């Protein structure tokens, strides 16, 4: 199952891309974590390519 973490402040879960290992803010409204998750899965088009730098926090 795709790896997730909760940010230290507690306001945001992040999911790790199984290809590039960057952490992406978890898309809202997901019914489940998939077996593998990639930037390419992101409903947010700004964080859909592994080359996009990882957001802070």
Decide: 52 and 43 in contact? Cβ < 8 Å: no
Asked whether residue 18 is marked as a ligand-binding residue, the answer is no
Q: Which of 17, 23, 42, 47 binds Zn ion (CB under 5 A)?
A: 17
Tell me: does residue 20 bind Zn ion (CB under 5 A): yes
d(CA 44, CA 41): 9
Which range touches Zn ion (CB under 5 A), out of 8-16, 28-36, 39-47? 39-47
What does the chain come to in residues? 57
Which range touches Zn ion (CB under 5 A), out of 3-11, 27-35, 36-44? 36-44
Tell me: does residue 15 bind Zn ion (CB under 5 A): no
d(CA 54, CA 15): 11
């Amino acid at each position: 199952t795709a790896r997730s973490k909760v940010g230290g402040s507690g306001d945001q879960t992040w999911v790790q891309c199984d290809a590039c290992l960057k952490w992406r803010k978890l898309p809202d409204g997901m019914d489940q974590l998939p077996e593998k998750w990639y930037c390419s899965n992101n409903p947010d088009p700004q964080f859909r390519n592994c080359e996009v730098p990882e957001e802070p926090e």
